[PDB]
Amino acid sequence: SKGEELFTGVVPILVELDGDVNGHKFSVSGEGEGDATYGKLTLKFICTTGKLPVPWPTLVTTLVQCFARYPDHMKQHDFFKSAMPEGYVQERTIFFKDDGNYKTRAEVKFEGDTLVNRIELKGIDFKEDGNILGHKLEYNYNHHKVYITADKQKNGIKVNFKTRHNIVQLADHYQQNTPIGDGPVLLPDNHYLHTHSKLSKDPNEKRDHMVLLEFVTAAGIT
Ligand SMILES: [Cl-]
Ligand SMILES: [Zn+2]
Ligand SMILES: [Zn+2]
Ligand SMILES: [Zn+2]
Ligand SMILES: [Zn+2]
Ligand SMILES: [Zn+2]
């Protein structure tokens, strides 16, 4: 697709999130770069409103799958790049086992050379002594397969996966992505993305933050 040509090199990224979980409002901003040729994302996130009222790892999935590396034989299945530069809307619900849920809406699109992911998140029904509001999560390495199928009536895709974070907390993620523009997109055969991520800290950063390194690779079609 033509969208694909936009990702041939290193692309700067801006990520922005306004959130409200059980009435606790906050905001996060992040920046870095993506290199789809390697499926590689490197980002640093800051909580601009002070202390994050939820654990950083619970926000990773919310905080740009257009940077996935699609092998050559699968490139006709890359919906995400095909929707660019006009972009796509990503809507998710995340159901935390025995606890609350997040509902999110994001617009992912190019603003000139910058890929911008602008998000709103609302979280409800969380328990005060649950794992999310009680901040009980580890902060290490994860790998999850992200399953994708076409949603042809909406000219987009439907996505599902599970996460697990050690305290273990389970979450079911359900996602729908729809193009912003009216032009043609690639509607994929069923496949999945390997999503491998590592969180860390910047030793010189005083603000509440997260450094993220992520490698995303499409698979599941022989
Ligand atoms: Cl994986
Ligand atoms: Zn925490
Ligand atoms: Zn809004
Ligand atoms: Zn493992
Ligand atoms: Zn989790
Ligand atoms: Zn994997």
Short mmCIF file of C-alpha atoms and ligand atoms in Angstrom, two decimals:
data_model
loop_
_atom_site.label_atom_id
_atom_site.label_comp_id
_atom_site.label_asym_id
_atom_site.label_seq_id
_atom_site.Cartn_x
_atom_site.Cartn_y
_atom_site.Cartn_z
CA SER A 1 0.00 0.00 0.00
CA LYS A 2 1.00 3.68 -0.15
CA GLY A 3 0.72 3.95 3.63
CA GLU A 4 3.56 1.43 3.79
CA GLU A 5 6.03 3.84 2.22
CA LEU A 6 5.62 6.20 5.23
CA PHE A 7 7.23 3.65 7.55
CA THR A 8 10.39 2.74 5.64
CA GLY A 9 12.62 4.69 8.00
CA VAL A 10 12.67 5.85 11.61
CA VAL A 11 9.52 7.80 12.48
CA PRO A 12 9.08 10.11 15.44
CA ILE A 13 6.12 9.34 17.72
CA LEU A 14 4.07 11.43 20.13
CA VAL A 15 1.72 9.62 22.47
CA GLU A 16 -0.85 11.48 24.56
CA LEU A 17 -3.34 10.20 27.11
CA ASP A 18 -6.03 11.77 29.27
CA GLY A 19 -7.34 9.33 31.82
CA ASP A 20 -9.90 9.06 34.60
CA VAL A 21 -9.95 5.89 36.74
CA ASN A 22 -12.54 5.73 39.52
CA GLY A 23 -12.67 9.55 39.31
CA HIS A 24 -8.90 9.99 39.56
CA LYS A 25 -7.93 12.17 36.65
CA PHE A 26 -4.45 12.11 35.11
CA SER A 27 -2.48 12.70 31.97
CA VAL A 28 0.49 10.99 30.32
CA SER A 29 2.71 12.19 27.48
CA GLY A 30 5.31 10.15 25.68
CA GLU A 31 7.74 10.46 22.83
CA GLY A 32 10.30 8.46 20.95
CA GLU A 33 10.47 6.67 17.64
CA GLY A 34 9.34 3.65 15.70
CA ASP A 35 11.18 1.65 13.08
CA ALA A 36 8.76 -0.75 11.37
CA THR A 37 11.51 -2.40 9.34
CA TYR A 38 12.56 -3.95 12.66
CA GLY A 39 9.20 -3.83 14.42
CA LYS A 40 10.92 -1.67 17.05
CA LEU A 41 9.42 0.99 19.34
CA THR A 42 11.43 3.04 21.85
CA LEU A 43 9.42 5.49 23.97
CA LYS A 44 9.63 7.36 27.23
CA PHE A 45 6.45 8.30 29.07
CA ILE A 46 5.88 10.91 31.77
CA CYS A 47 2.88 11.44 34.01
CA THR A 48 2.38 15.21 33.60
CA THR A 49 -0.20 15.51 36.37
CA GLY A 50 2.06 14.17 39.11
CA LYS A 51 1.80 10.62 40.42
CA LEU A 52 0.07 8.00 38.27
CA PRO A 53 -2.94 6.58 40.22
CA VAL A 54 -2.72 3.26 38.34
CA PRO A 55 0.27 1.01 37.67
CA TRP A 56 2.35 1.85 34.61
CA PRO A 57 2.13 -1.69 33.26
CA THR A 58 -1.69 -1.44 33.07
CA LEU A 59 -1.27 1.41 30.54
CA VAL A 60 1.23 -0.23 28.19
CA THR A 61 -1.33 -1.75 25.83
CA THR A 62 -3.18 1.56 25.65
CA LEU A 63 -0.05 3.62 25.04
CA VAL A 64 0.73 2.21 17.65
CA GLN A 65 0.57 -1.13 15.91
CA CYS A 66 1.34 0.51 12.59
CA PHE A 67 4.99 -0.07 13.66
CA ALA A 68 4.64 -3.88 13.48
CA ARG A 69 7.12 -5.67 11.26
CA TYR A 70 5.11 -7.57 8.64
CA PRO A 71 7.20 -10.12 6.79
CA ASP A 72 7.23 -9.66 2.97
CA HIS A 73 4.85 -12.60 2.39
CA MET A 74 2.27 -11.04 4.76
CA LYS A 75 2.43 -7.42 3.72
CA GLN A 76 -1.04 -7.54 2.11
CA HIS A 77 -2.42 -8.16 5.62
CA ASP A 78 -1.15 -4.90 7.19
CA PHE A 79 -4.33 -2.90 7.85
CA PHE A 80 -2.56 -0.44 10.14
CA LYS A 81 -0.13 1.09 7.64
CA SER A 82 -2.72 0.93 4.85
CA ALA A 83 -4.93 3.40 6.75
CA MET A 84 -2.13 6.01 6.84
CA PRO A 85 -1.64 8.91 6.64
CA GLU A 86 -5.33 9.65 7.39
CA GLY A 87 -5.14 7.20 10.27
CA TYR A 88 -7.47 5.02 12.31
CA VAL A 89 -9.58 5.05 15.46
CA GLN A 90 -8.74 2.33 17.98
CA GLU A 91 -11.43 1.53 20.56
CA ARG A 92 -10.75 -0.93 23.34
CA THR A 93 -12.28 -2.41 26.39
CA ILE A 94 -10.03 -4.10 28.97
CA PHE A 95 -11.77 -6.29 31.53
CA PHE A 96 -9.57 -6.91 34.57
CA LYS A 97 -10.40 -10.20 36.26
CA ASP A 98 -12.15 -9.70 39.60
CA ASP A 99 -11.83 -5.94 39.20
CA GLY A 100 -12.71 -2.92 37.06
CA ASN A 101 -12.46 -2.14 33.40
CA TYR A 102 -10.85 0.45 31.12
CA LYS A 103 -12.57 1.80 28.04
CA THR A 104 -10.36 3.67 25.61
CA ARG A 105 -10.61 5.61 22.38
CA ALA A 106 -7.54 6.64 20.40
CA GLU A 107 -6.89 8.43 17.11
CA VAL A 108 -3.68 7.34 15.45
CA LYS A 109 -2.55 9.39 12.46
CA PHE A 110 0.31 11.31 10.91
CA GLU A 111 0.73 15.00 11.62
CA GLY A 112 3.39 15.76 9.01
CA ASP A 113 6.32 13.44 9.76
CA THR A 114 5.15 12.65 13.30
CA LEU A 115 2.98 9.65 14.12
CA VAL A 116 0.59 10.79 16.85
CA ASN A 117 -1.43 8.52 19.15
CA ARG A 118 -4.01 10.61 21.02
CA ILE A 119 -5.99 8.70 23.63
CA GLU A 120 -8.79 9.04 26.14
CA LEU A 121 -9.28 6.42 28.84
CA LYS A 122 -12.03 5.88 31.36
CA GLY A 123 -11.75 3.30 34.10
CA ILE A 124 -14.60 2.25 36.40
CA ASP A 125 -15.65 -0.20 39.08
CA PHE A 126 -12.13 -0.72 40.43
CA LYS A 127 -11.63 -2.08 43.97
CA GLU A 128 -9.67 0.04 46.46
CA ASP A 129 -7.67 -3.01 47.59
CA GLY A 130 -7.51 -4.58 44.15
CA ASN A 131 -4.26 -4.92 42.25
CA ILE A 132 -4.78 -1.85 40.09
CA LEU A 133 -5.59 0.86 42.66
CA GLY A 134 -3.41 -0.92 45.24
CA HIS A 135 -0.36 -0.72 42.93
CA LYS A 136 0.92 -4.27 43.34
CA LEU A 137 2.47 -4.99 39.92
CA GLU A 138 5.91 -6.12 38.83
CA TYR A 139 7.68 -4.14 36.15
CA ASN A 140 9.61 -6.37 33.79
CA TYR A 141 9.30 -8.33 30.56
CA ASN A 142 6.15 -9.52 28.75
CA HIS A 143 5.13 -11.28 25.56
CA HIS A 144 1.58 -11.60 24.25
CA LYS A 145 0.12 -12.66 20.95
CA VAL A 146 -2.41 -10.11 19.58
CA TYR A 147 -5.03 -11.76 17.37
CA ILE A 148 -6.41 -9.88 14.38
CA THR A 149 -9.35 -10.56 12.09
CA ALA A 150 -11.13 -8.42 9.49
CA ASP A 151 -14.30 -6.50 10.30
CA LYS A 152 -15.40 -5.92 6.74
CA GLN A 153 -18.71 -4.18 7.48
CA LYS A 154 -16.71 -1.42 9.21
CA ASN A 155 -13.82 -1.55 6.76
CA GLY A 156 -11.52 -2.32 9.69
CA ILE A 157 -10.39 -5.04 12.05
CA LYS A 158 -11.26 -6.63 15.37
CA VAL A 159 -8.51 -7.59 17.77
CA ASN A 160 -8.36 -9.68 20.92
CA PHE A 161 -5.78 -10.87 23.45
CA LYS A 162 -5.12 -11.53 27.12
CA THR A 163 -2.48 -10.05 29.40
CA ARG A 164 -1.03 -11.22 32.67
CA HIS A 165 1.04 -9.20 35.13
CA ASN A 166 2.70 -10.68 38.18
CA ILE A 167 1.71 -9.18 41.52
CA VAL A 168 -1.21 -12.82 39.11
CA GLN A 169 -3.64 -10.38 37.45
CA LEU A 170 -5.45 -11.30 34.28
CA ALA A 171 -7.08 -8.94 31.77
CA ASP A 172 -9.12 -9.62 28.62
CA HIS A 173 -8.54 -7.02 25.87
CA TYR A 174 -11.03 -6.42 23.07
CA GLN A 175 -10.34 -3.91 20.31
CA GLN A 176 -11.90 -2.49 17.16
CA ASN A 177 -9.99 -0.34 14.67
CA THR A 178 -11.65 1.63 11.90
CA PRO A 179 -10.07 3.91 9.28
CA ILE A 180 -10.54 7.68 9.60
CA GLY A 181 -10.41 8.27 5.86
CA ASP A 182 -12.65 6.98 3.11
CA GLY A 183 -9.92 5.52 0.86
CA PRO A 184 -9.21 1.79 0.41
CA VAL A 185 -7.59 -0.25 3.16
CA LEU A 186 -6.19 -3.78 3.43
CA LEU A 187 -8.56 -6.15 5.18
CA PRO A 188 -6.40 -8.98 6.48
CA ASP A 189 -6.77 -12.71 6.78
CA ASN A 190 -6.66 -13.91 10.36
CA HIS A 191 -3.17 -13.57 11.86
CA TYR A 192 -1.49 -12.25 14.97
CA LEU A 193 1.26 -9.98 16.22
CA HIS A 194 4.02 -11.04 18.60
CA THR A 195 4.21 -8.16 21.04
CA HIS A 196 7.31 -8.34 23.23
CA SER A 197 7.89 -5.52 25.68
CA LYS A 198 10.28 -4.41 28.39
CA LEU A 199 9.76 -1.60 30.91
CA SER A 200 12.48 0.24 32.72
CA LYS A 201 13.46 3.52 34.36
CA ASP A 202 15.54 6.50 33.33
CA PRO A 203 17.95 6.89 36.31
CA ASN A 204 18.08 10.67 35.82
CA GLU A 205 14.33 11.22 35.49
CA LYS A 206 12.75 12.64 38.65
CA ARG A 207 9.14 12.64 37.43
CA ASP A 208 6.93 9.53 37.58
CA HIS A 209 7.71 7.80 34.27
CA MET A 210 8.27 4.65 32.23
CA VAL A 211 10.81 3.76 29.52
CA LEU A 212 9.43 1.25 27.02
CA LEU A 213 11.18 -0.95 24.47
CA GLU A 214 8.89 -3.01 22.31
CA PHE A 215 9.29 -5.41 19.37
CA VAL A 216 6.19 -6.25 17.32
CA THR A 217 6.24 -8.91 14.58
CA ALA A 218 3.37 -10.24 12.48
CA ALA A 219 2.96 -14.01 12.17
CA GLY A 220 0.37 -16.71 11.86
CA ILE A 221 0.22 -17.06 8.08
CA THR A 222 2.35 -19.78 6.47
CL CL B 1 4.18 -13.12 21.82
ZN ZN B 2 2.94 0.84 40.47
ZN ZN B 3 -12.81 13.60 25.19
ZN ZN B 4 7.07 -15.87 29.44
ZN ZN B 5 -2.18 -6.28 33.46
ZN ZN B 6 6.04 -13.71 20.72
#
